[PDB]
Symmetry: D2
Subunit: 317 residues, 4 copies
């Protein structure tokens, strides 16, 4: 068993746990410890009841400083700073840090120092890390040497695969993105800050000063829509683009990217493990060179499963 | 005073009336008749109360074939055919048809035959009508021979002015749009309140019709989200002239003060959709959301009140029609 | 095997099917035919994708005149009137009529005439059917000679069990209810941002089931823009003096005993959506129980207004097909 | 005219200002100072644009140490402590404290010490206070001596008038309330507001018993938050001595609305939804169509209110009474 600890039991941490069990990737990975400065029972409870994904199918309990998913007893810690984490004592192979506060080399080193073999951050974190993984695209680029890695963000993890597929096939010249985020808020469309372009140009440096992004928050549940527009060199038609993407979903990107032409709405992709689901019915091409594609993703669940995918790769290399 | 009749007292019809009074444009134009298939009080009530806005500031009464807004009398009719409309009897200068059912030439002729000097449709309709007016862009192209005219749609009326401004300044090569609307196809039989729902958009067709130079150069998609009243349009265009985000913003800001005052607005304030509720502008450009990818791919987000803006344009166009 | 046909594949009909499979009651019941005046391709699609309940876990297919949940084939019919239904040909033991249009005796007789042994309506029907079953309360009064029966409504099915429990224990003198539903010049308007009064058939339904409460029960209801789960705010005057926690203890005991699987009890800090897809007819929220003086009880009861009811349809169906002489 | 300063420019503070100008109580009250921790420009923005009330009709300019509503020049302070407030310098007749933090009479004394003649809190207060005015019910009990007074809460200000009317006419024996509110302590608090019905704490049970001490151990209350806009619904249930019918109750309340409680309580039988009462200055609007009576003694009444606007106007009403008495 690969044994992981989770630092920070927020939304993403909780989902990683839920995902571990539902995906059955329990067989290959046991969570041994969770750490959040937050009261233990608020965790057990919040793990059991989730606003988007239903009651957790497994039986959850929290007595003492011990969380319980099914028959597993997860030791619950309340450390405030990285050094005093008993990673060594627990034999932690990978620490998934989902705190959202920690993210630099030093934080990584601190985790390793505390006894963890490797670290995986649930966000981009400081630039200079031993690696950055958008699973399904560049997991093959992982080494032994690589011990402090970032898993990108849920939005970058959603759109990067598509941008790659499109760039490889048609040569992207420039791109612009609009992200429609789910959640006064409960009536408006709210313009919000977005880091998604920084994330794209970082992963694809050939796109510096060639990509921009805006984003809005709307009062929907759980699922996010990404509205991607790119200029390409090779002339293309809407259905050719769709055929490319559909093929990718059945081939090289099976399980990571999905494709659909069914008449669906956002909530239908709730609890969908894919990093991205391409909506074929929304694909457009203006002239022969401006491609619009709408990509759905469960902004938490997809990412959560990628955390686990990346973890496995890290522990295996 | 120009006298108008309203055919169809739906959402848009009601707003046109509300707009007439609130805009203060009651001094130039008067509503003499409304023709509806619903009950009469049905109308008075819905005119007084609506969920998009607030209680109508004016006092709304209702008696049988009548309707009262303030001191003004408005003959309420219930005719299922245009032939039998007493437009002649009432001296109607313009009929604003907001039924959403009528829209070809013949329907226009029918209204005129019934005694109306001119007709204005609250939508695109079929192609061959005298002119489609996107007020603030091409109202100067109204001759008096134009008797049956279309007011475009609220979304086309929102984005066309921006597309013109950008094309004039930088030469648009191709474009793509996403419309985020507020609240057959199997998507239609399912809950609005938690989902982003792809819907059919005819915005594409409307743009290329108004700008024929853009055939096979514009596409559009749209989604419906469970927000109130205000619509966001996410426009992306490739241009010839190289540009920077703030140059684009400066252009649009200038237009808002200048040539397009009262039709397009510009803002850099941190606002959300509901802040544009009841805003008379056809379009409000959100400067903070302008982007340029490379030097040639412009993204601009434009807000509009999808009913109020359009409702005021109906009145603006009406005036223009009655004045030429 | 008990073999059922479903007349009307609307919201409730679809859920009955989903419920049959998810609850494993499919070992004991078979849906052999569905009839709806709707596009059969659309039937399959709507069965697979639901706004409340998510993607149906089973594999759904449609082709010509067959729907396919899993490896099962259901005959899809399109008859516009009750007379021409091939119930006899298919050996239907019970017809679950979830059309919401049909509900008289005659409609029942028509179904039986068409070849169905018994009929179960997904609503309270007219006033004089053979039985109304609020399962868990009076299913023991089903005899084998009741062939046209009503399953009450989801709201009545939700609150009746609680009213019984309270009446038995303390003697209800009078009652008033407020129902908060999830999503006439009010229907003609924007449901995404308002509390909307709506008419309710609940006071009718209660006094019908408990005739001793005529002119002693009233009800109002509002619609709010939430998802799927309904809250019932019950207020009753009782004879026996009581305290909040006594009432809670009574109800909690019922939930573990006589009403296990039908009524549930909870003290956990939950919100409506947590009862989404809950099979109980009613879940009592202990934390919201109150008693004013010693005689005015307030209790808040949650229910999944569709799922609970759907599973009760199946429960009642079984009882009807089983009830021996 | 009467001069007022506003301590705390939150939701309520902002609305008081908006109300002053819109209601037309501007020919009777002037705001001279707003003391607030955030910058003069933040203040001005939020005053102009509101999530729940639209664009403020007046022109909101900003300059120097001044806000401007029309040609009226209001002054902005950022005094962190209470003693350093220049109330004396500005000749403040009443301080409306809408901070929600201050509410003890020491706080009151502090304001007065700083130079304010009288103080009015936008909530119940931490108490041992001079008075508690639910305007339209007991403003006549104000005395030149009461210098530190509380304006109750918006919910108490909404339902108290109705409870009085009902008690006077039929003698309330006991009561229970449900409030339907729009949008570490609880585990419910940090959960998605968009889509669930959310049970929460409520102090209405107290506020009522405090105002009507004859109801100790005779009133209880619960409340839920739903994702609607701005307007609040209060679902009141009371037992009464005198036997009554639904329409008698309605007739009583309707009469009150034109008569003794004109401008404070309103009555309607029109088919309306919550948003229709948005920006309604009444403390309470009674929905006749929802009135019920179970037996002859259990009254259910549903009362709407704009939980901010009504209250804000009452703040102004109470202020006037205080400065006048
Ligand atoms: C934003 C925008 O401009 C937009 C977007 C999509 C579609 N439309 C067009 O708006 C027009 C009507 O909108 P409205 O919501 O006002 O219509 P409604 O749904 O409220 O109903 C119309 C109203 O008229 C009645 N009616 C029907 N037929 C009638 C006749 N013959 N005579 C009198 N009244 C009639 C109907 O019962 C209801 O009361 C459309 O053009 C639409 O395409 C705008
Ligand atoms: C039901 C009812 O009547 C109701 C509804 C809402 C709120 N209340 C009560 O009124 C008090 C204020 O609540 P509100 O929500 O208006 O406040 P806020 O969160 O909008 O912001 C307060 C405001 O005060 C400023 N402030 C804080 N500390 C300050 C000091 N020391 N000096 C000056 N200003 C200060 C703060 O920055 C913000 O601008 C509550 O009691 C509530 O129960 C009633």
């Amino acid at each position: 068993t690969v044994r992981v600890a989770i630092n920070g039991f927020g939304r993403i941490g909780r989902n990683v746990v839920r995902a571990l069990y539902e995906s059955g990737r329990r067989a290959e990975i046991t969570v041994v410890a969770i750490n959040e400065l937050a009261d233990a029972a608020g965790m057990a409870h919040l793990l059991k009841y989730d606003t988007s994904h239903g009651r957790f199918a497994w039986e959850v309990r929290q007595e003492r400083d011990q969380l319980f998913v099914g028959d597993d007893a997860i030791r619950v810690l309340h450390e405030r700073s990285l050094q005093s984490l008993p990673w060594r004592e627990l034999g932690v192979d990978v620490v998934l840090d989902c705190t959202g506060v920690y993210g630099s080399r030093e934080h990584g080193e601190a985790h390793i120092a505390a006894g963890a073999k490797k670290v995986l951050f649930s966000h981009p974190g400081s630039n200079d890390l031993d690696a950055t993984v958008v699973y399904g695209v560049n997991q093959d680029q992982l080494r032994a040497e690589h011990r402090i890695v970032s898993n990108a963000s849920c939005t970058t993890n959603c759109i990067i695969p598509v941008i790659k597929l499109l760039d490889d096939a048609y040569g992207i010249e420039s791109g612009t993105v609009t992200t429609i985020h789910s959640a006064a808020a409960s009536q408006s469309i709210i313009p919000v800050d977005t880091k998604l372009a920084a994330g794209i140009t970082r992963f694809f440096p050939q796109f510096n000063d060639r990509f921009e992004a805006i984003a809005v928050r709307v009062p929907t549940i759980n699922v996010t829509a990404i509205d991607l527009s790119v200029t390409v060199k090779k002339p293309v038609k809407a259905n050719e683009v769709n055929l490319l993407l559909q093929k990718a979903a059945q081939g090289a990107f099976h399980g990571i990217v999905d494709y659909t032409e069914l008449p669906l709405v956002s909530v239908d992709f709730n609890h969908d493990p894919h990093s991205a689901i391409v909506d074929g019915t929304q694909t457009r091409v203006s002239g022969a060179h401006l491609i619009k594609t709408l990509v759905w993703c469960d902004n938490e669940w997809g990412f959560a499963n990628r955390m686990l995918d990346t973890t496995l790769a890290m522990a295996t290399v």
